[PDB]
Design a protein around this ligand. Sequence first.
Ligand SMILES: *[C@@H](CC(=O)OCC)[C@H](C[C@@H]1CCNC1=O)NC(=O)[C@H](CC(C)C)NC(=O)[C@@H](NC(=O)OCc1ccccc1)[C@@H](C)OC(C)(C)C
Ligand SMILES: *[C@@H](CC(=O)OCC)[C@H](C[C@@H]1CCNC1=O)NC(=O)[C@H](CC(C)C)NC(=O)[C@@H](NC(=O)OCc1ccccc1)[C@@H](C)OC(C)(C)C
Lengths: 305, 306
Amino acid sequence: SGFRKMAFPSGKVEGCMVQVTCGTTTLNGLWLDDVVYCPRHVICTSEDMLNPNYEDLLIRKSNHNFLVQAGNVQLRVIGHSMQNCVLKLKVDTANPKTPKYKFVRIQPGQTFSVLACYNGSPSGVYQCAMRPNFTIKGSFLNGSCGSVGFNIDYDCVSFCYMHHMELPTGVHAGTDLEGNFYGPFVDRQTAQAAGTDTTITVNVLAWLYAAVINGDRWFLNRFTTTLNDFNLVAMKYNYEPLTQDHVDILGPLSAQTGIAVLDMCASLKELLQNGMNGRTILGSALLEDEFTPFDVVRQCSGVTF
Amino acid sequence: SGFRKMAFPSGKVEGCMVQVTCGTTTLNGLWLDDVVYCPRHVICTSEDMLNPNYEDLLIRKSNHNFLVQAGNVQLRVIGHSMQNCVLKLKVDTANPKTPKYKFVRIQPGQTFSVLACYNGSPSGVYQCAMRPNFTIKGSFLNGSCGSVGFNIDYDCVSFCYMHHMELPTGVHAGTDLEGNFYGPFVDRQTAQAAGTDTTITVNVLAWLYAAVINGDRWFLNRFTTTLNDFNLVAMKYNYEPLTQDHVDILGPLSAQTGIAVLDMCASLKELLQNGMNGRTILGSALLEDEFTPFDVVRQCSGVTFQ
Ligand SMILES: *[C@@H](CC(=O)OCC)[C@H](C[C@@H]1CCNC1=O)NC(=O)[C@H](CC(C)C)NC(=O)[C@@H](NC(=O)OCc1ccccc1)[C@@H](C)OC(C)(C)C
Ligand SMILES: *[C@@H](CC(=O)OCC)[C@H](C[C@@H]1CCNC1=O)NC(=O)[C@H](CC(C)C)NC(=O)[C@@H](NC(=O)OCc1ccccc1)[C@@H](C)OC(C)(C)C
């Protein structure tokens, strides 16, 4: 038993991180097959990050203006191009450690593991969720751009995030590995802000199922609710609306526990209206919303990779 | 900016996980050079769970009673010995993925990453503190024993924990890699309970410093405290006493923020008296105590957001 915020094992992604240098700017790159992917703002000096013209900046660059370091082995760049906000560097050597992988674009509410890297060297791993406002509450300092987020669907690494920037409230924004931003952001240093966020209701409910599975049942009640009357209370507390597809996804957890989805909704409604009353759930004083239903199942059944 | 519970990258440890089987029992083992380390209760049967005599169980085994699988390759066991609560299986092949490593015994309050493993394969990685009562708040199921805890310093892996058991409140207990349990626990299924646990005060202070580094000062106040008066109040909230050594290890964080340690102690006293009143600190509505001063320095910026 026990329930922790748990990242995927990172070994397969560790073997893909490299250091990419253009001029005085150095950040991280992802080395897969014979291409290195990194944020396109690597071709910026500090003096053109306000309104960079990326087409023009790259037009003046040649393959030899890019230094890619994998360990203490340099990888010759033999071609370069942009795809959206990602720079793609073709190198002379296919990564022998390339895992089975795909690029996926995730939706708000979905979680992923982040391998935070500096100078091409992995420094730590943690879980994030893509917020409904398309930011993530990460932990990133200068030099972390190019760090990647990922999930493992047994043996296949699904890359879903590359890190680009930090916003004033200290939350983080980036792209998929095809260079498309999550959220209404741009890769320059003009004023931008995260929108108002909401709580991921289906994840809260999955976390309550995780709570039941771990022996905490004090928040369960014998009341019932319809889907509509719960959504009426939820939005009052700034919760994402609960859909039938959300109810359906919670099916396996409802089956394992014997607590119907609407009955867990009635418990969440009471938790929202009355609070925890000095009690805690799974060590938290807040209702946690960064576990997906599959996150709960993977952890509580000991799924491996 | 930001502040997260952060594990060490698990690849160097993933390369050492193997599966150990003795009879009907399978668990995880740690393969370093030509030795595999696993919990000794792999040799127990259903009749040996309350009062096993491990010496008498182990003398009845040959090398070939132990099957060690690394991937889909069986390693041949060529020697075995018992050291406290761990078994050491000598194998005929050195692990080519062995990192630089050390075995260390950690002190209460220190943290480490756990690689949860089943059948020799990794499931996930998470961060844990050794509680003052010598338990950890992990996530472990049947089959997880032999999973190891570790810290990584400049590509040297310091192994500090091997998992052995769960207690009835849901917390976990285990040994160092020399097989000596943390705390008063034994590898028997006789009734056992963790002692009354306490909050790791120096870690809570480190975390408040993290909050200030990341730009939040709302919880500070104009007061200070003596060390003795702080310890008298904080013990009433089941907080571990703060020592001068703890005050000293907080020196770097104090100097980066301009907040004397005893002044942060005054802030903690008031937070305990008042609670949060609907606010959070670094995203949490309770006082977090599983980040060491070292963890904060590792993860936070070297420049305070003033
Ligand atoms: C990664 C780049 C890198 O690693 O290069 C190393 C040489 C960083 C990651 C940031 C730095 C601090 N924490 C992070 O996660 N990326 C950047 O610095 C971004 C470069 C741009 C060219 C994309 N810049 C920012 O993240 C910037 N945010 C920003 O400008 O957003 C717009 C804005 C909003 C309000 C006011 C002005 C601008 C950061 C650095 O600026 C702050 C003030 C928002 C933190
Ligand atoms: C690893 C080996 C394994 O799976 O073997 C299965 C037969 C597990 C890890 C546990 C399983 C559940 N979560 C974990 O972390 N270790 C064990 O199963 C232990 C084997 C013993 C030979 C050491 N047993 C326990 O962990 C046991 N705890 C226990 O007996 O504590 C003593 C006790 C205290 C009060 C009352 C009775 C016993 C667990 C499995 O038993 C429960 C009922 C306490 C959970």
